[PDB]
């Protein structure tokens, strides 16, 4: 009975990476914060002092 909806992941289609700087910056920024949210925190360090 299983049924899903195709994700539709056609690539770039639009090449903004060659003029729309203004917006890339906004993307990068975004994708970046996104990243930090994931990058696991570290553990077992050497006592600062």
């Amino acid at each position: 009975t299983a049924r899903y909806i195709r994700p539709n992941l056609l690539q770039d289609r639009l090449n903004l990476h060659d003029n729309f700087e203004s917006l890339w910056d906004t993307i990068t920024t975004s994708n970046y914060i996104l990243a930090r949210s994931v990058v696991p925190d570290l553990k077992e360090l050497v006592s600062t002092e």
Binding site: S22, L23, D25, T26, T29, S30
Partner: peptide, 28 residues
Amino acid sequence: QLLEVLKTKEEHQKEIQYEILQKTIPTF
């Protein structure tokens, strides 16, 4: 004395402009 009354009159100039740019960047 001068090298610190000019890291404040150069963080207005630097500011306003570093921003006049941020208005060209649709970043929340």
